[model samples]
Target: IPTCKITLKETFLTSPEELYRVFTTQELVQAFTHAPATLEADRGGKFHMVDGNVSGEFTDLVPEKHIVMKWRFKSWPEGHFATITLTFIDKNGETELCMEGRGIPAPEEERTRQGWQRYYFEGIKQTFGYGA
Candidate 1:
């Protein structure tokens, strides 16, 4: 059995700096996910997203440009954490949000991917007017 990886890229009308805040700010995350979130943006900061369905700690921070973190779903194998790397690339005035998820159990790959799609990516657009 091999672990899986997930890659996702989406464009947002928001700037990189503000887009970064969307992930790291509790108010913004709550608005986007439609649930409370606990986030501390600095390195080693502990966090929970989507109402704590996922929990993790920040491993690294490049402030508004890059983020490295490890988080796990409630239903995953005990002690299993998946590494996530997020990059915000500014394309003209829009931000291209790139996400890489590694070490996911193979069976949960689709669930992991869909979580991002429904909870993070599209959530930002629909919640914040970051989409067309």
Candidate 2:
């Protein structure tokens, strides 16, 4: 059964466009994830994340602003999917990421958050020279 909700508030030293691209653009995702992606970047377009283990279909998208998708991990039972919604805010050229996940399976919560922290945050901060 789908269970668990996650919200991670984070700040990044980059423009909204840059931060959003980390998820929507294939090359940028590859740079941080070290995993290639085949993202459609449009509503109903299918996508893969983290070397293809995580898959989803875009349900809503707004460039550099919001992304909503029906997401799922390969380990989850077939036919069950979680929802991931990301909101990006611009503050004087820097970006604030409001990352949220809904309906995640109980056991996958920790790994899901860790995945974002490790590959998305760390990778972007280091790769783009956004570190302090």
Candidate 3:
């Protein structure tokens, strides 16, 4: 089966450490996404998002710089997983967040992209009063 890849670069009016914490802390995740989340910031720890529609385990983490995970949506094909990488670059007082996903099921490509925009990009910005 063919797979799709997604890459997004978004700037946030916050520091890299703050952005990283939002991704790794359950409380902050909930604040942005407006949904309960389970997160453990350690490598090999697990995370669940969108009320558990998405689940994953951390494959790698480098504090405020990078995070890698094996991610899968509940609706995805059995045993299929995507690799998601988020890199946080400090841009003076702001953060440039770069997110990439590989091996996403082709059929889910569009919805997945929109989902990220809805739940991460817009959600974070609106929740934190960052961007217009």
Ordering by lDDT: 3, 1, 2
Which pairs clash inside model 2?
A: none
Model 3: what TM-score? 0.94
Q: Report, for every candidate in turn, its global Cα lDDT versus the true structure.
A: 0.89, 0.85, 0.89
Better of 1 and 2 by TM-score: 1
Q: List the residue pairs that clash in candidate 1.
A: none
**What are the per-residue Cα lDDT tens digits for candidate 1 across 1-132?**
479999999999989999998888878888887887889888989988765689999999897799999989988877789999999999998999899999998999999999899888888899989985
The lDDT, on a scale of 0 to 1, for candidate 1 is: 0.89
Q: How well is each residue in 1-132 modelled by candidate 3, as lDDT tens digits?
A: 699999999999989988888888889888887788899888999999877898989999999999999999999988798999999999888999999999999999998899888888898889887675
Clashes of 2: 0
Q: Is candidate 1 or candidate 2 better by lDDT?
A: 1
lDDT tens per residue, model 2, 7-43: 9878888898987877788777777777778888899
Kindly provide the TM-score of model 2 when superposed on the true structure, using C-alpha atoms. Answer: 0.92
Measured against the true structure, the TM-scores of the candidates, in listed sequence, are 0.95, 0.92, 0.94
